[PDB]
Amino acid sequence: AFELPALPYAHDALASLGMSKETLEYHHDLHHKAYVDNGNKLIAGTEWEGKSVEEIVKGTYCAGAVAQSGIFNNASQHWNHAQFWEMMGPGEDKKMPGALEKALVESFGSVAKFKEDFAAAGAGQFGSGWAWLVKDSDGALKITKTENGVNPLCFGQTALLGCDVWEHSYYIDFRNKRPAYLTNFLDKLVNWENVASRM
Amino acid sequence: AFELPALPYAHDALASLGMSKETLEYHHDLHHKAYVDNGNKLIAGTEWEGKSVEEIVKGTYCAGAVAQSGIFNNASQHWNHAQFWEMMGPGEDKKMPGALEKALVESFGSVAKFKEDFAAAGAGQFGSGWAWLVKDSDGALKITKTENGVNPLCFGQTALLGCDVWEHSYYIDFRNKRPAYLTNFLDKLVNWENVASRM
Ligand SMILES: [Ca+2]
Ligand SMILES: [Ca+2]
Numbered sequence: 555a556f557e558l559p560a561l562p563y564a565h566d567a568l569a570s571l572g573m574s575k576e577t578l579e580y581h582h583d584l585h586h587k588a589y590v591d592n593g594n595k596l597i598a599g600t601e602w603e604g605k606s607v608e609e610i611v612k613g614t615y616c617a618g619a620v621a622q623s624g625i626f627n628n629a630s631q632h633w634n635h636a637q638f639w640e641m642m643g644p645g646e647d648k649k650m651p652g653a654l655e656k657a658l659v660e661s662f663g664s665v666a667k668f669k670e671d672f673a674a675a676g677a678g679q680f681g682s683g684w685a686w687l688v689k690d691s692d693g694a695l696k697i698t699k700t701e702n703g704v705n706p707l708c709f710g711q712t713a714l715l716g717c718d719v720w721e722h723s724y725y726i727d728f729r730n731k732r733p734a735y736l737t738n739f740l741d742k743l744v745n746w747e748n749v750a751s752r753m
Numbered sequence: 754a755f756e757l758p759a760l761p762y763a764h765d766a767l768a769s770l771g772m773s774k775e776t777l778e779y780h781h782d783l784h785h786k787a788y789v790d791n792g793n794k795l796i797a798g799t800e801w802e803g804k805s806v807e808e809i810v811k812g813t814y815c816a817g818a819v820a821q822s823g824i825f826n827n828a829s830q831h832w833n834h835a836q837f838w839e840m841m842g843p844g845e846d847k848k849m850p851g852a853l854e855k856a857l858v859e860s861f862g863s864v865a866k867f868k869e870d871f872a873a874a875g876a877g878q879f880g881s882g883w884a885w886l887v888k889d890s891d892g893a894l895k896i897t898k899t900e901n902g903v904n905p906l907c908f909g910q911t912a913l914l915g916c917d918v919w920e921h922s923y924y925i926d927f928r929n930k931r932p933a934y935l936t937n938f939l940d941k942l943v944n945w946e947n948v949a950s951r952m
């Protein structure tokens with residue numbers, strides 16, 4: 555029983571910050587909805603129907619497969635998009651909590667360096683996927699990238715921040731300019747309080 | 754070096770058939786150009802600098818890998834896009850040559866069935882990639898699908914038709930409606946004479 559979560563803001567709340575109303579309508583109301591609906595259809599009457607999204611992602615991931623199952627593809631994307639919406643928010647010059655800032659400075663040298671590494675990872679995922687800031691099982695903060703719906707749950711990592719680099723996430727607003735999208739995302743869209751709360 | 758081939762028609766020649774001028778400008782002038790340029794930059798001063806695109810694709814493909822090298826990613830996409838532009842063309846109700854029609858009926862039961870299977874493969878490639886009609890090493894025709902830049906050269910197959918299902922190929926004109934794009938492509942855009950010539 556996957557459900558499409560409401561956005562934590564109006565569909566037009568990110569427009570002045572570089573993610574248009576049109577993008578949120580297509581991305582949330584159609585793409586995320588499809589992962590929920592297709593996920594439910596595929597999961598119905600299987601061993602996975604009882605389970606949490608997290609359990610389904612971890613249980614259906616096939617390590618080393620180029621292509622994952624339909625159940626994985628939809629379950630993982632459902633979870634990813636749910637995090638993504640919460641990781642952004644309205645407001646000019648959103649502030650970074652101390653504990654997060656300190657950890658970023660310690661792991662990357664500076665927030666500016668963190669942001670450059672994150673943007674580089676996003677640009678570097680060839681095809682569809684995600685860039686992430688994760689806390690790994692040693693407690694280290696680091697940048698990762700994944701294909702398609704694959705995500706930090708597949709590696710026993712905790713997602714702190716994710717940025718969708720599937721083309722649908724940015725093509726309306728940035729066309730081919732994935733690097734400008736990533737930069738803008740990090741500078742204007744990220745809700746750092748939500749990021750910090752995942753630590 | 755790799756060079757960006759000119760389109761075999763004006764940038765606006767497919768607009769009345771459902772692929773806009775804007776799509777061809779971004780897709781050819783920016784995306785394909787990036788594969789050429791990034792390909793060249795990565796190939797410069799390597800073992801591959803002398804070689805044909807085909808040799809580079811076959812030589813750099815890693816069958817045992819989730820992600821391919823930068824050289825592979827760009828070389829394969831350069832080849833794919835070069836084929837793609839020639840596989841489409843202007844004109845309402847473009848002629849399908851007899852030899853191709855016969856071969857499709859022989860392999861798929863009917864042209865309609867071929868088109869359904871091709872569209873299903875395109876819809877079924879989760880994330881970025883390609884749908885193909887190929888002649889395999891037994892000389893039979895079949896439908897395949899591949900991720901990212903992976904293509905029939907990687908499997909000792911001959912590409913007859915490819916349809917780009919990376920989102921940039923359709924998002925301007927169809928947004929999330931990849932199935933409508935595929936249907937339209939098969940109905941209006943394919944230059945069947947170019948397809949037949951590859952047999
Ligand atoms: Ca809409
Ligand atoms: Ca017709």
Ligand SMILES: [Mn+2]
Binds near residue numbers: 581718723
């Ligand atoms: Mn998405």
Ligand SMILES: [Mn+2]
Binds near residue numbers: 780917919921922
């Ligand atoms: Mn393309």
